[PDB]
A paper describes a structure:
Integral membrane proteins belonging to the multidrug and toxic compound extrusion (MATE) family contribute to multidrug resistance by using either the Na+ or H+ electrochemical gradient to extrude drugs across cell membranes. MATE proteins identified thus far can be separated into the NorM, DinF and eukaryotic subfamilies based on amino-acid sequence similarity. Those crystal structures revealed a similar protein fold comprising 12 membrane-spanning segments (TM1-TM12), they nevertheless suggested different arrangement of cation- and substrate-binding sites between the NorM and DinF proteins, hinting at substantial mechanistic diversity among the MATE transporters.
Hypothesizing that NorM-NG would interact with verapamil differently from DinF-BH, we determined the structure of verapamil-bound NorM-NG to 3.0 Å resolution by combining molecular replacement and MIRAS phasing. Notably, the verapamil-binding site overlaps substantially with the multidrug-binding site in NorM-NG7, with verapamil and drugs including R6G following similar trajectories within the central cavity and projecting themselves towards both the N and C domains. Furthermore, the bound verapamil in NorM-NG adopts a folded conformation, with both aromatic rings stacked on top of each other. This double-layered conformation bore little resemblance to that seen in verapamil-bound DinF-BH, which does not involve π-stacking between the two aromatic rings. The most notable differences between the R6G- and verapamil-bound NorM-NG structures reside in two extracellular loops termed L3–4 and L9–10, which cap the multidrug-binding cavity in the transporter. In verapamil-bound NorM-NG, both L3–4 and L9–10 moved away from the multidrug-binding cavity. Overall, a small number of amino-acid side chains make direct contacts with the bound verapamil in NorM-NG. Among them, S61 (TM2), Q284 (TM8) interact with verapamil through H-bonding interactions, while A57 (TM2), F265, V269 (TM7) and P357 (L9–10) bind the ligand via van der Waals interactions. In addition, the carboxylate groups of D41 (TM1) and D356 (L9–10) are ∼6 and 3.5 Å away from N8 in verapamil, respectively.
Residue numbers in the entry:
A (entry chain A): 5 to 463
B (entry chain B): 1 to 91
Write the structure that this text describes.
């Protein structure tokens, strides 16, 4: 009962120069989809019933879920980048890009359809020239989801190595959304005002990033076999059925924060809804510098599952620590420059909707959860990142939601200034991964004892 | 005068049977053989045999999980034998 977690620190020898730092440039580009969202957010302010984002919100819902499913090939194609058939990774790449449709379609279809019931039983709302005019720009704001998957399937074939293009066609992305979002929300000659021609406009440029994929077979050697990518053999086509047990439980695990939804916003309004609701400059600026962080494991992820295929066993699972903690560096250094500062109401030209009279009982989980999970899921993003590992990550989060039961009404059930009160066993749900998760990672890190079935050959 | 095939890799098994995916970087004017004994020398030796870059294959794993010691064989231009490398890790 003392240490059922064996070798503690010894995810280590002398690795100091593990330059997993194209991984940064998975979130140097991935800041791109940050640095669009808020152009559309801070442009459709020239309409004040441009709370558009009300759609652009519960859109991400079915993108980011299904994006899980798709973030799933980040091993697939590294695992076989320890191979040679970049076309037998390709036949998969194609097979997913096909999938990339398929789902994107069937997803954007749920949107495409279901949407309407934005009014049911304990339910409804009615500024009609507002997002009712834009529930018809939920649709346009939706009709990429077919093409976005195919164009996030994009970075799943960045896996490999060259992450350069992703950086380009996202620096050549907010190249556009300004341009196109004005022209299509307003300044015509000729497409005047589908005013929330952000959703109309954004959706445009997916298709543009989409064939910012296509336009990068150009670079080196092929990953092109999209001749009628097909599905069938037995009951149903694998390298597709394969993509299932990886995909699924990362979306259904992205259903974590997809209920850090019903929580992060639900007791933002008791009888006290003031800066309690304003834990969005709280937990929106939580999310902002959370990506550059965590997104590196969703980038570490390659460096591993590939460096498994290249048969470098744990000559890589014992980098899945030297990454873990090279960001664990930043885990602290910017929780430091987190609780430290407060000036979210930057007074330059103006803000988006976050305004001046508020207390900063928010810097109080700029600590709590901020360094103590900075890491805690980039665990999986290397468990999957390496391995099968999200079959019990799905179930990693069987607690990270279902242990927030009263850690939901635990801000509202208090003894002190409990604003981070249900940030209870949800910043302690959140640190039951520094066990549960990485504790698993030095245990299955140590199947590279089981699988490295012969330490050292002749010379 | 040289060295072996080179690398040392059974990964594991389908319990009864086992993987054997070793260094064979290309082939030569080549051929392989793998020994198929355990580690007593009692239950005799057996000879799988293969060609291309193909030390990277697998067995017909016959019994439970006893200690099995299994060699692979180089062969090249002079119809003779680079050097064997060998290993025993059994289930
Ligand atoms: C996935 O949900 C989201 C997460 C973060 C953001 C970024 C927030 N932006 C800085 C915009 C300002 C925040 C704001 C809006 N829009 C907003 C924040 C959080 C919200 O609940 C999730 C919200 O309701 C949709 C609106 C203000 C007006 C209340 C938007 C999101 O969807 C709109």
């Amino acid at each position: 009962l003392d240490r059922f977690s064996f070798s503690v620190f010894l995810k280590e020898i002398r690795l100091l120069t593990a330059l997993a730092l194209p991984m940064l440039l998975a979130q140097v580009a991935q800041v791109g989809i940050g640095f669009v969202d808020t152009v559309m957010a801070g442009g459709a302010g020239k309409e004040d019933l441009a709370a558009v984002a009300l759609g652009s919100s519960a859109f991400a819902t079915v993108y980011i879920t299904f994006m899980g499913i798709m973030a799933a090939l980040n091993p697939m194609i590294a695992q076989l980048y320890g191979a040679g058939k970049t076309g037998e990774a390709g036949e998969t790449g194609r097979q997913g890009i096909w999938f990339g449709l398929i789902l994107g379609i069937f997803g954007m279809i749920l949107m495409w359809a279901a949407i309407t019931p934005f009014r049911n039983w304990l339910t409804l709302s009615d500024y009609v020239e507002g997002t009712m005019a834009q529930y018809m720009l939920f649709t346009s704001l939706a009709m990429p989801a077919a093409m976005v998957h195919r164009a996030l399937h994009a970075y799943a074939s960045s896996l490999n190595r060259p992450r350069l293009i992703m950086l380009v066609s996202f620096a050549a992305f907010v190249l556009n959304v300004p341009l196109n979002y004005i022209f299509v929300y307003g300044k015509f000659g000729m497409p005047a005002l589908g005013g929330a021609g952000c959703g109309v406009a954004t959706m445009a440029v997916f298709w543009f990033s989409a064939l910012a994929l296509w336009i990068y077979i150009a670079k080196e050697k092929f990953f092109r076999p999209f001749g009628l990518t097909a599905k069938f053999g037995k009951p149903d086509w694998a390298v597709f059925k394969q993509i299932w047990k990886i995909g699924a439980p990362i979306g259904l695990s992205y259903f974590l924060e997809a209920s850090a939804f019903s929580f992060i916003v639900f007791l933002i309004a008791p009888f006290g809804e003031d800066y309690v609701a304003a834990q969005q400059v709280g937990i929106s600026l939580s999310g902002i510098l959370y990506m550059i962080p965590q997104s590196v494991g969703s980038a570490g992820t390659v460096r591993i599952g590939f460096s498994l295929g290249r048969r470098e066993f744990s000559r890589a699972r014992y980098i899945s620590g030297v990454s873990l903690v090279s960001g664990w560096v930043l885990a602290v250094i910017t929780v430091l420059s987190l609780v430290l500062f407060r000036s979210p109401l930057a007074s330059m030209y103006n803000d988006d909707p976050a305004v001046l009279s508020i207390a900063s009982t928010v810097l109080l989980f700029a600590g709590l959860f901020q360094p103590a999970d900075f890491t805690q899921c980039i665990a999986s993003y290397a468990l999957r990142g390496y391995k099968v590992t999200k079959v019990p990550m799905f179930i990693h989060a069987a607690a990270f939601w279902g242990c927030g039961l009263l850690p939901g009404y635990l801000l509202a059930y208090r003894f002190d200034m409990g604003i981070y009160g249900f940030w209870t066993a949800l910043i302690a749900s959140l640190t039951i991964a520094a066990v549960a998760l990485v504790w698993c990672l030095e245990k299955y890190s140590m199947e590279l004892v089981k699988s490295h079935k012969a330490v050292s050959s002749g010379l | 005068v040289s060295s072996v095939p080179t690398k040392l890799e059974v990964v594991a098994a389908t319990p009864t049977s086992l993987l054997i995916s070793w260094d064979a970087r290309g082939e030569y004017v080549v051929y392989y053989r793998i020994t198929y004994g355990e580690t007593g020398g009692n239950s005799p030796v057996q000879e799988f045999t293969v060609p291309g870059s193909s030390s990277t294959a697998t067995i017909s794993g016959l019994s439970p999980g006893v200690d099995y010691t299994i060699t692979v064989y180089a062969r090249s231009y002079y119809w003779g034998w680079y050097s064997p490398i060998s290993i025993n890790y059994r289930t």
